[PDB]
């Protein structure tokens, strides 16, 4: 839910009255997490 | 104790003076100690000076009884002893220290009188003889203003000292030397204007952006009288001009403040160039809709400048702002939907259940949500819902109901030169008094500062200028100076005047005849002046006492002269002074109404000290209600610096502990004060908790009606959360408080719309939109005007209003979406950058949109670069070698 | 190297010399 | 409800050389403040309006009688009697008089009360002890948003969570997404979150509560959580408001199992400060802010998504966040033309806000050692190790 | 007042003993004359000190 | 009205519901010399001379 809601917090941040799928990733982002799982892992 | 290794300086220029008689010593040892001060006080950035420490106590007596001398030689060993006197004078000396200078540095000259102080980064004889010359020198020119020499020879060191302030160092210093020209000369400041003008136009032109930033700050909050004011608003001119950037539509901003004088600034400053017309000039015609006057007195007359001549001319008047407008509302940006006023007004799901039918046809409410639905789609040729099918609609209300209802379907196409005529031609032959008057008022509604060429309203209503009926004089004076808002043309003043000289008419239309033709004039118009006087003489004591309609008739006289500073307002207090004390309401108005940016202490002064206070025991009614709705006047936006303290005054002071019948209501201010929206500042506080307050019945409705002010485009989240929070759940029994909630709370919705003084760029105010004065007395009477629906005219009289979008395009249309940044304004202009207004991008709107006030844009990757830099809504993006 | 802390004819001349013209009426002012 | 707080004056601040516009704005505040002056001063010159009602009055005084003790109305009964709690802790089943208001009675509005035989006799708006009223902001902090340095994300945060909800919300239920209930800044010490609440409270538009965290905590017992009740219940009655606890980690550690009295009573304050967070709707407009530098200390249900949604992070500024910082703090130096600046900023180290502030300090002070003002570049090259006090060398290369 | 709670008189403001006491009311008899070395030391914390308290308008 | 009514007893309802009356007390002669008596020294103490050596030392202190 706290996801979500960051999701609309990012859509309002760029002032699109449409939330998109990129500001659903920054949310998770943001929330989720609080190169090393890229440099090794492929 | 000392340094003892450098113990040298506490002996040597000791000794030196102390020693001093032998003419040949005396030379040698001046000499040396100049080198010295000099290799001191020249390169060493060390503020402290070693010399200048251990000159003081000794040089007090030594360098001042060796002051004298003799003169052994003819001038040369005094000139030595005052270039060295001349180093210890900022402490070593007491606060006649221009008493030092008079008689050290200013009685003589070393040659180069600063060949010891041109050196000097700032200290020596910049900062300190900068002072010594805006003290002493304006001390003389205030009691000695033509004194001898030494007001003359002062004056060309002052002046070298100001063009070295420039290039002696070249830096930030620049914003001291306008400054000294203010303080120095007080008497003759514009000899120091032409001096700096001379300076810095021929020195360096980047250097001239903080000129004018400078001389525009020191506009907003200048001098108390308008003596200097108007100096420092003509020093600019040629800066300009082409010694600077030809373009710089500034000089209409610069010509607006002066009194907004046309015909004497205008005639030159681009009417005689008009050589890049081709250029933003064209938009600077556009930028100038104030003053169509203007370009009737070059382009029509001549019509030989340029091809477009005329065209121009019409398309900027309202033509293709109007198809913008339309082309905004519909073709890019879809926000035109159809917005009644049921649509929202019950936005609350209280208002759902709990009713119990509460569905009443009434007058008031319906009177209302015809006005709600004439202001939300203002301007708006897509409002088919209460226009033509609803007939009836117009029909099922009261008499006064007609006026209003059809005044409300004409305000729908608002400026629609074509539309609004053939949408009026419907109701023109309505077969009804009042909704007569409501057509010829939608007639004149189309017309609000259109100066159509065929000028239709003066012709359509001249029928009912004087015609047998009130309702009928009414609405057709109401829609003329609706449409002569701007201009003054001599027709409609000798149609008008003799109407506002009869007497057939009731006091009613006499005052709507008076604020009429008042509003149609901003100058003089002197006949206009003796009509007001006549009738104010030639009227009956109760008639102008108690009739509640005798306010309007000085408020034409004022806005006739507003602007324009107490030149004429002395005489037009000497005649008034001759009246039943109702005009005592009369001078506090006029007067007070004749400057829209004044901010000055004694005008404001004189309103809170006889004004305010020399009333509160008084119960002479409507007083003290224009003096503080009107301490705001002259007030509006001097930069807006001027307002906070202000609104502090006003909440402080008057709203808490002020006459509960004189100045309990002391809200409207609000209104006209400033008016965007923002909490605890302007509504939230001072606005809803006297709302809540419904103690007092008028202040109730009138501050209800005062978020009209920040109502515009308020967008009304927040602020429709009151409406909800009040309707039904708040002021739902009172009938009129009701309906004026209504009013004011739901003509929120009309979009990309403004109504204040302040233009785009913000340091000139509108005299045609300071109009909306009429709509600010009679909303305060609220008797036979708002509460009392004895005239509901003034309540659509808000005809100054523009749109608050911004549009760009390039010598053809629209089409430019150039990337824009619209955001709220920061620290700008005069500190040590010109940092961009907005501080961020917050906003990345690329296409044409609303700019609020508080909100201002910055062009983008350095494309299509407008040369306008006042971005008064219609940007124009002339390219250049962009990227270079 | 001992530093020399400010004597009174120090202050006095740091107060002064590389000041505004304006220090006293705008610090009174506010 | 009433209406928020904190009054401020002009920001001015739009000068700083000194340059005589400075003077006409001071000047013009200042003819400002005049007439307040002389206008309060004629009007109670010239004010005779009392008596008039008098003897019911003075009949509903004598009544009350003298002095009436104020108390806290913790239950109501059938509308003639209540119970109400005196400041000792003791409350009583006492009658209610005709004459007070019973629509305002609430569980919790303070009650003025007969000294003798207690009878709830009036009732008062405007309790708020002296400690919750010092804990309200009355003149705003003079630093704002233009004296933040960096910080671009974290300001765009904070608007985002106190401001938006508090101007235009629209967004906010357009979106339907509820407005964030509270946030909590933090971050290593001296980054800027107090400065940030500092901003917050000068571009303001509602009531700003500043709370010191370890404030709260009260001798007496239940005064915590009494003293916690009071701020909150003032921040809905003053609503818009927005409550500031800076080291919210004086009370926020880990809860654990309370042994003494006193930590119990802690545990208590707590658990009341979080009733009240919940209490509240995050619809309300209300909203708090809690600082702190060990956020890795703080109570995991403190920063529960449903009481804290929001976590603001203060990083140590970054290169081009400290020229920014040190181009701020030296706006009001008069730096001479030979210094770069660059080198204190290339140098890899942990500076903060609060480092370059005292770098800008010393380097000052160094200068006016040299008896100058100019401040060279040398003068900052000492007073950056003279402040910065305190990996083996070649190990990493 | 005894039992009627009237105010009758305003007396200095509200600071209890345990920091009452801590102002330094006997000023000990220590002199920079006393303390060899740390000239240093004793500039810079005058530096901090007094000079803030006694001139700030550098 | 030669006293004064105390605070304490005006809060607890004097000069309201009752009043103070002036209290006097009747002590003649014969009373008073008989409560002479309590600390009337005696015939004995005038002629008892203080401890000699308590005398001197509190002479010497
Ligand atoms: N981004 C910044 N720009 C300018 N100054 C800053 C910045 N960050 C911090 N400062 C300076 O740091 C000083 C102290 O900062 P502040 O009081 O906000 O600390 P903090 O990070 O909240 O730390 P703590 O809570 O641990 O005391 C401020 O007075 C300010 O001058
Ligand atoms: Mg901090």
Redesign the interface.
Same mark, same amino acid.
């Given at each position: 839910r706290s996801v979500c809601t960051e999701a609309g917090m990012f859509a309002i941040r760029a002032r699109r009255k449409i939330a998109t799928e990129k500001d659903f990733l920054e949310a998770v982002n943001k929330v989720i997490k609080s190169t090393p799982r890229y440099m090794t892992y492929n | 104790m000392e340094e003892g290794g450098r113990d040298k300086a506490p002996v040597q220029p000791q000794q030196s003076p102390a020693a001093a008689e032998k003419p040949s010593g005396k030379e040698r040892r001046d000499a040396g100690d100049k080198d010295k001060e000099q290799e001191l006080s020249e390169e060493d950035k060390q503020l402290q000076d070693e010399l200048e420490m251990l000159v003081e106590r000794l040089g007090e007596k030594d360098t001042s009884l060796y002051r004298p001398a003799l003169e052994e030689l003819r001038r040369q060993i005094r000139s030595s002893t005052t270039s060295m006197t001349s180093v210890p004078k900022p402490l070593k000396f007491l606060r006649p220290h221009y008493g030092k200078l008079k008689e050290i540095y200013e009685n003589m000259a070393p040659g180069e009188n600063k060949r010891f102080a041109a050196d000097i980064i700032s200290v020596l004889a910049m900062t300190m003889s900068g002072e010594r010359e805006c003290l002493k020198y304006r001390l003389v020119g205030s009691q000695e203003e033509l004194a001898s020499w030494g007001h003359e020879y002062v004056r060309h060191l002052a002046g070298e000292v100001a063009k070295e302030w420039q290039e002696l160092d070249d830096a930030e210093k620049v914003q001291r030397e306008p400054l000294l020209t203010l303080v120095k000369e007080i008497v003759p400041y514009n000899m120091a204007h032409n001096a700096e003008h001379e300076a810095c136009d021929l020195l360096m032109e980047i250097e001239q952006v903080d000129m004018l930033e400078k001389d525009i700050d020191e506009n907003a909050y200048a001098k108390v009288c308008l003596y200097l004011t108007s100096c420092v608003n003509y020093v600019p001119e040629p800066e300009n001009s082409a010694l600077l950037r030809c373009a710089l539509g500034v000089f209409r901003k610069f010509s607006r403040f002066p009194e907004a004088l046309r015909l004497a600034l205008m005639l030159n400053d681009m009417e005689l160039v008009e050589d890049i017309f081709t250029s933003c000039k064209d938009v600077v015609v556009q930028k100038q809709m104030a003053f169509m006057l203007g370009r009737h007195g070059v382009f029509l007359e001549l019509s030989e400048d340029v091809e477009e001549y005329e065209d121009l001319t019409e398309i900027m008047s309202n033509v293709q702002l109007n198809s913008n407008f339309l082309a905004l509302a519909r073709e890019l940006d879809i926000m035109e939907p159809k917005v009644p006023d049921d649509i929202y007004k019950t936005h609350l799901e209280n208002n759902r259940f709990g009713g119990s039918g509460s569905q009443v046809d009434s007058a008031r409410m319906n009177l209302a949500s015809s006005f709600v639905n004439g202001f939300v789609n203002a301007a708006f040729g897509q409002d088919k819902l209460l226009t033509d099918d609803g007939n009836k609609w117009l029909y099922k209300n009261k008499d006064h109901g007609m006026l209003s209802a059809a005044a409300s379907l004409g305000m729908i196409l608002l400026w629609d030169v074509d539309g609004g005529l053939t949408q009026i031609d419907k109701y023109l032959y309505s077969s009804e008094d009042y909704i007569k008057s409501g057509a010829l008022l939608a007639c004149g509604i189309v017309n609000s500062g259109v100066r159509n060429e065929c000028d239709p309203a003066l012709a359509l209503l001249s029928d009912y200028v004087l015609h047998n009926s009130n309702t009928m004089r009414l609405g057709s004076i109401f829609g003329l100076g609706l449409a002569y808002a701007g201009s003054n043309r001599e027709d409609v003043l000798t149609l008008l005047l003799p109407v506002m000289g009869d007497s057939k008419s009731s006091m009613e239309v006499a005052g709507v005849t008076a604020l009429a033709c008042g509003m149609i004039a901003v100058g003089s118009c002197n006949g206009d002046v003796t009509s007001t006087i006549l009738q104010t003489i030639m009227e009956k004591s109760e008639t102008e006492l108690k009739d509640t309609y005798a306010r309007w008739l000085p408020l034409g006289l004022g806005l006739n002269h507003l602007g324009k500073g107490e030149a004429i307002e002395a005489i037009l207090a000497a005649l008034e002074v001759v009246s039943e004390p109702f005009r005592s309401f009369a001078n506090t108005l006029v007067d007070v109404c004749a400057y829209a940016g004044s901010g000055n202490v004694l005008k404001v002064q004189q309103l809170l000290h006889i004004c305010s206070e020399h009333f509160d025991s008084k119960e002479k009614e409507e007083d003290k209600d224009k003096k503080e709705k009107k301490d705001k006047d002259k007030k509006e936006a001097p930069a807006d610096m001027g307002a906070h303290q202000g609104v502090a005054v006003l909440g402080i002071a008057l709203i808490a502990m002020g006459e509960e019948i004189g100045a309990e209501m002391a809200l409207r201010t609000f209104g006209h004060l400033l008016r965007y929206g923002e909490p605890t500042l302007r509504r939230a506080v001072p606005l809803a908790l006297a709302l809540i307050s419904v103690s007092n019945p008028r202040l109730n409705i009138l501050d209800t009606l005062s978020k009209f002010s920040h109502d515009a485009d308020p967008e009304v989240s927040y602020n429709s959360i009151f409406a909800m929070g009040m309707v039904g759940s708040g002021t739902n029994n009172a009938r009129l408080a009701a309906m004026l909630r209504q009013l004011a709370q739901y003509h929120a919705k009309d979009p990309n719309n403004l109504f204040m003084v302040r233009l785009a760029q913000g340091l000139t105010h509108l005299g045609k939109g300071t109009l909306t004065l009429c709509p600010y007395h009679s909303d305060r009477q609220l008797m036979s005007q708002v509460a009392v629906a004895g005239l509901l005219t003034v309540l659509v009289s808000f005809l100054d209003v523009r749109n608050i979008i911004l549009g760009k395009s390039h010598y053809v249309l629209y089409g430019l979406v150039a990337a824009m940044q619209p955001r709220m304004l920061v620290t700008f202009d005069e500190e040590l950058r010109p940092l961009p207004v907005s501080v961020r991008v917050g906003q990345a709107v690329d296409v044409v949109g609303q700019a609020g006030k508080p909100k201002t844009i910055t062009g983008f990757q350095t494309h299509t670069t407008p040369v306008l830099l006042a971005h008064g809504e219609r940007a124009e993006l002339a390219t250049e070698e962009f990227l270079p | 190297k001992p530093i020399r802390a400010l004597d009174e004819g120090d202050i006095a001349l740091l107060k002064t010399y590389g000041q505004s013209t304006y220090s006293r009426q705008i610090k009174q002012v506010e | 409800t009433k209406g928020p707080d904190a009054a401020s004056k002009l920001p001015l601040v739009t000068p700083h050389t000194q340059c005589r516009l400075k003077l006409l704005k001071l000047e013009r505040i200042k003819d400002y403040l005049l007439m307040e002056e002389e206008f309060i001063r004629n009007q109670e010159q010239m004010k005779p309006l009392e008596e008039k009602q008098e003897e019911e009055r003075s009949k509903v005084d004598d009544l009350r009688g003298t002095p009436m003790s104020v108390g806290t109305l913790e239950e109501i009964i059938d509308d003639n009697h209540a119970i109400v709690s005196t400041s000792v802790g003791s409350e009583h089943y006492v009658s209610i008089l005709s004459f007070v208001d019973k629509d305002l009675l609430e569980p919790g509005c303070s009650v003025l009360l007969n000294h003798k035989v207690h009878a709830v006799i009036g009732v008062l708006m405007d309790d708020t002890d002296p400690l919750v009223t010092v804990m309200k902001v009355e003149k705003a902090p003079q630093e704002t948003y233009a004296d933040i340095g960096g910080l671009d994300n974290q300001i765009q945060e904070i608007k985002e969570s106190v401001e938006l909800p508090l101007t235009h919300p629209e967004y906010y239920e357009e979106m339907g997404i509820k407005p964030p209930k509270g946030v909590i800044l933090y971050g290593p010490p001296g980054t800027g979150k107090t400065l940030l609440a500092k901003a917050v409270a000068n571009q303001t538009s509602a009531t700003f509560l500043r709370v010191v965290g370890s404030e709260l905590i009260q001798k007496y017992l239940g005064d915590g959580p009494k003293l916690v009740r009071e701020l909150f219940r003032v921040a809905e009655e003053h609503a818009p408001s927005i409550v500031f606890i800076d080291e919210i980690d004086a009370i926020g550690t880990k809860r654990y199992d309370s042994n003494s009295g006193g930590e119990r009573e802690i545990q208590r304050t707590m658990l009341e400060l979080l009733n009240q967070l919940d209490g509240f709707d995050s619809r309300g407009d209300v909203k708090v802010i809690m600082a702190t530098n060990r956020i890795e200390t703080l109570d995991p249900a403190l920063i529960r998504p449903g009481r804290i949604d929001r976590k603001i992070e203060f990083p140590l500024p970054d290169e081009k966040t400290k020229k920014r910082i040190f181009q701020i703090h030296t706006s009001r130096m008069t730096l001479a033309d030979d210094v770069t600046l660059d080198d204190l900023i290339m140098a890899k180290d942990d500076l903060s806000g609060a480092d370059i502030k005292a770098i800008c300090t010393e380097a000052g002070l160094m200068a006016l050692r040299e008896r100058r003002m100019k401040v060279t570049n040398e003068d900052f090259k000492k007073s950056k190790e003279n402040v910065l006090y305190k990996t083996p060398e070649g190990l990493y290369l | 007042?005894? #039992?009627?709670?009237?105010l009758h008189k305003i007396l200095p403001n509200k600071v209890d003993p345990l920091v009452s006491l801590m102002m330094v009311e006997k000023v000990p008899d220590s002199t920079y004359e006393m303390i060899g070395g740390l #000239? &240093?030391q004793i &500039?810079e914390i /005058? @530096?901090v000190i007094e !000079?803030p308290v /006694?001139?700030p @308008? !550098? | 009205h030669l006293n004064k009514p105390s605070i304490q007893a005006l809060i607890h309802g004097l000069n309201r519901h009752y009043y103070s009356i002036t209290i006097n007390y009747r002590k003649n002669e014969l009373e008073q010399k008989m409560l002479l008596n309590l600390h009337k020294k005696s015939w004995m103490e005038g002629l008892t001379l203080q401890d000699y050596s308590e005398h001197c030392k509190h002479n010497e202190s």
């Open positions: - | - | - | - | 007042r005894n #039992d009627s709670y009237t #000239d &240093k &500039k /005058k @530096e !000079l /006694k001139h @308008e !550098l | -």
